[PDB]
Amino acid sequence: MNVAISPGVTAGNSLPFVLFGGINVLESLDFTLDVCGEYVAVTRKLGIPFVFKASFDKANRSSIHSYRGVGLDEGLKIFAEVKARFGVPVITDVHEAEQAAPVAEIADVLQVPAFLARQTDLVVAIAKAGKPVNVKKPQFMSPTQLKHVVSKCGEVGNDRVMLCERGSSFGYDNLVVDMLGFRQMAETTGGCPVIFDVTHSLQVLDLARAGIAVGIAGLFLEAHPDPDRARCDGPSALPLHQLEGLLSQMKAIDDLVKRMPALE
Amino acid sequence: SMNVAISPGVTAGNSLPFVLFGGINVLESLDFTLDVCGEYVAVTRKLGIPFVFKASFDKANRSSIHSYRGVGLDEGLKIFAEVKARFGVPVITDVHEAEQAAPVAEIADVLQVPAFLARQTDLVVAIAKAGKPVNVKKPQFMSPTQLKHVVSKCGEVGNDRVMLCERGSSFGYDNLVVDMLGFRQMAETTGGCPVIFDVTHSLQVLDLARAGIAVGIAGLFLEAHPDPDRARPSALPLHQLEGLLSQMKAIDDLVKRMPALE
Amino acid sequence: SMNVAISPGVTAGNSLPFVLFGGINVLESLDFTLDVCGEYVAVTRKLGIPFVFKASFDKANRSSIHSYRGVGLDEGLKIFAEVKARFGVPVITDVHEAEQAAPVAEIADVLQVPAFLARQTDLVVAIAKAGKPVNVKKPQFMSPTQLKHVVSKCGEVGNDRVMLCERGSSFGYDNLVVDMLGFRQMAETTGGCPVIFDVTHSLRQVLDLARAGIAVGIAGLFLEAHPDPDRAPSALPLHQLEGLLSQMKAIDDLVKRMPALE
Amino acid sequence: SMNVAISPGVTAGNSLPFVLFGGINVLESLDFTLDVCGEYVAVTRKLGIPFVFKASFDKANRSSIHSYRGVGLDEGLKIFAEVKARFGVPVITDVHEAEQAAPVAEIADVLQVPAFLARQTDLVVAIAKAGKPVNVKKPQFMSPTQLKHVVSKCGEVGNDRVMLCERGSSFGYDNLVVDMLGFRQMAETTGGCPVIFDVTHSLQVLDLARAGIAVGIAGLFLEAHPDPDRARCDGPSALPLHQLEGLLSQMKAIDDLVKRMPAL
């Protein structure tokens, strides 16, 4: 199944990989524009399809007082300016059923947060909003169970679903990426595009190389100019200056493996 | 060990006689709820075990939009109101949306945060703000030392009456295992919150229940059904309730009068 | 289920009063061995708990070839002979090489298969052939239902006196978690072999784990102790032994007179 | 980092073209061994991939004491001598008991420490003292940063020619997952030992092999058989032999590409 996101950007497991790349959360217009512009410049140079990613709300910080981002209303204003400035499609996450329709007016893909992937009403609200849907696979969920979420989407008329790996629970706290999961998610859901979040899955290069070599529809990436200074106990973003170096290796492997067959 | 007063005559605490949070998966009819709740009340009253009746009014996380979800909020609250009026038993239920907490708190005696939702700031705050004691289910993805953050969110909005509920940790794909070292970790990192063990969702129910009760905990969380084979995770057969509870009580009374080592 | 006669008045069985397999990590000196065992003997005699003294004569799997390995076979067996002569207690020790089994079985009353060697056909067969009861340590990588194949190898060469020993299961990197449901799976898939729980290797929280395992209803506890474990995984502080054991006996005596559910 | 010379024209190293350590589960007869080795030689030659033939002379841990164990030490070494004589290939086998190390080392070119026995001091020392390169199998219970203890044991008795072989990690009961982050950790914590990936035991063979090879490693470890379904084992299934060329051509293409890409 190939999922058409915007003109010239289509995701599919046999197609050239799509970078879903951006930042953790919207803090300001200018900072968003500058980071997005650098993503655009690099992906344009290399010839990699690109969807810009950001959250408008951090809905699950440790403290009710922790910074949560600019929020829904201002976030969608920022996304509108990004789309106008760069002609790039955008993807963002949706935490509450009531956000789905307003977000769908602006965003080109709506993401189901991993912890919320089983919540029927949220998933239905997101699926009914009429845009392609990216389902984050929670660390507690095996790859053959994601089909139920895909089915809930199809039951309310949305067949344009993508599935995003971000690791599996491995003891306490640690995540392991089972590289056999990508095919199992694809094959049990009718061939949904599979995307790999190499940021939350934690050596980013080892992991991204491993995942791209398997043969997948997309990469999911967060970046920052200075990741070590994040005001976050979240997982480290890629340092932004490393983007081109990373993506040139990804494209090289991706172009190679996408012309190699399965074993007969 | 902080103790949490649920009602007169029911108080949960890690040094106190265990409390049974028992009932059924989801509310379906007044008739069946009363049937099951009445058996729990009679057995617990006979054995002398503090009791809080448990049920969901909605199953918010089923695999299909057409899969039966239960009677829903408005009818659920009416059933709980009857359960309370007829038996004088306190009740606990789970809350899935922020806007549900206030109306639920008018009837329910304890509000539960669903496991998958434990990290969501707005839902937890709405539950905590509703002013009843809160039961936080520990997600299978969460280590026992991280639950303190959810509790702190509750404290941050004025609710210090928080209990923690164990239901297993992810062990490979699909399977859950219960780390019995987790109960003390949960308790000691949260200032001594009552710890509760869900022996149904964790899954040999007797083996697990015996093990958890022997550690010394505040409560057991249990679902039962008259015929769990032919119902559409597996509840205790309702006819085994008395036999299970008599062992739980026997072990619990023994261990709650034994100390830590020197 | 099946009972394993270890020595006169010491019999291990899942329905019988629990047996303590207790001692120390490794034999270092006669003096120290006698000091610790003497303490175990006096506490178990006082409390009325069947006792088997445990120690390795060699640490075959330590991180450097210069790391201290214990007194070794010849001297270790001499120490075990003294222990037996002086206290009249039976002893258990582990066997790392096939040719050690015959010599060890002249002195030791139970031979143990080390966890990492449990699948090695030739070692297990030599141990089973030596003619004493066998304790099989369940490796952290093995599921509870697979231990049957090791027990059958013992049976294939005429040794039907086999016990099984839980020490935890791999949980992510490095850490171990004890699945309390494993005891019954081990017992039921092996014709009811006695199941023993190593609370030491499985890991301040020795008490939580020990209470939980003893409450399931098992044949034995495996325990290592040391007078000053911090300044010496981590053994129980020896001065805590009587406190730990009095609680284990109390729980075991209670649960061993309770049935399965109807 | 470290390069281990196995024989003329065969050298394993994490920066070098990958080496195939390839063969069969156990030595059953001379002629079957020669035929299978002959097929590996033909394909590795055609493709230009360095090759070491692998086989066990004993299956030391079957479920039943009556189950077939292969030809045994004495006859196995006679078969190995003939393989070397006939094909000019180096060979690798596993050693289960201390006393087998010296006689095995007279014929074998690499001696392998079985995974379950990797912590056994006396076995590892007898293997290390035998004077040939050593392949330590990483047991599914051992974390990648702990393998350094085994390498140090080998060094303490004068053998610095050690390679480390990934076979998966325990993931719940029975299942294994391959953590693709472990390869670097094994290499960096041991002074740069060649890291090798057993795509057989670790279990979709192509997904896993593509992922591992893309990370950048010294070797692949593979068992094959003309009819794996009819194996008289309940062990993990061998690669069908007829798929060897197709698998290895993809491995070569990916390895050649990534071995000339830098760090970020």
TrEMBL record, chain B:
GO CC field: cytoplasm
Listed InterPro entries: Aldolase_TIM, DAHP1/KDSA, KDO8P_synthase
Keyword terms, alphabetized: Cytoplasm, Lipopolysaccharide biosynthesis, Transferase
GO biological process, one term: keto-3-deoxy-D-manno-octulosonic acid biosynthetic process
Binding site for phosphoenolpyruvate: K54, K59, Q112, A115, K137, R167
Pfam family, one: DAHP_synth_1
DAHP synthetase I/KDSA domain residues: 9-256
Main location: cytoplasm
Enzymatic class: transferase
UniProt subcellular location: Cytoplasm
Coiled coil ranges: none
Pathway(s) annotated for this protein in UniProt: Bacterial outer membrane biogenesis; lipopolysaccharide biosynthesis; Carbohydrate biosynthesis; 3-deoxy-D-manno-octulosonate biosynthesis; 3-deoxy-D-manno-octulosonate from D-ribulose 5-phosphate: step 2/3
Catalytic activity: D-arabinose 5-phosphate + phosphoenolpyruvate + H2O = 3-deoxy-alpha-D-manno-2-octulosonate-8-phosphate + phosphate
Record-level Gene Ontology MF annotations: 3-deoxy-8-phosphooctulonate synthase activity
HAMAP family: KDO8P_synth (MF_00056)
Entry's family note: Belongs to the KdsA family.
NCBIfam families: KDO8P_synth, PRK05198.1, PRK12457.1
Protein name: 2-dehydro-3-deoxyphosphooctonate aldolase
Taxonomic source organism: Burkholderia pseudomallei (strain 1710b)
This protein's encoding gene: kdsA
From TrEMBL, chain D:
Keyword Protein biosynthesis set for record: no
Pathway terms, separated by semicolons: Bacterial outer membrane biogenesis; lipopolysaccharide biosynthesis; Carbohydrate biosynthesis; 3-deoxy-D-manno-octulosonate biosynthesis; 3-deoxy-D-manno-octulosonate from D-ribulose 5-phosphate: step 2/3
Keywords associated with the record: Cytoplasm, Lipopolysaccharide biosynthesis, Transferase
Protein name (record): 2-dehydro-3-deoxyphosphooctonate aldolase
Places the protein is found: Cytoplasm
Family classification: Belongs to the KdsA family.
Matches recorded under Pfam families: DAHP_synth_1
Gene (UniProt): kdsA
Keyword Cytoplasm in annotation: yes
Enzyme class: transferase
Lineage: Bacteria, Pseudomonadati, Pseudomonadota, Betaproteobacteria, Burkholderiales
Amino-acid positions noted as binding phosphoenolpyruvate in the UniProt annotation, renumbered to this chain: K54, K59, Q112, A115, K137, R167
GO biological process, one term: keto-3-deoxy-D-manno-octulosonic acid biosynthetic process
GO molecular function: 3-deoxy-8-phosphooctulonate synthase activity
Gene3D superfamilies (UniProt xref): Aldolase class I
Reactions performed catalytically: D-arabinose 5-phosphate + phosphoenolpyruvate + H2O = 3-deoxy-alpha-D-manno-2-octulosonate-8-phosphate + phosphate
EC number: 2.5.1.55
Top-level division of the source organism's lineage: Bacteria
CC terms in the record's Gene Ontology section: cytoplasm
Occurrences of domain DAHP synthetase I/KDSA (ranges): 9-259
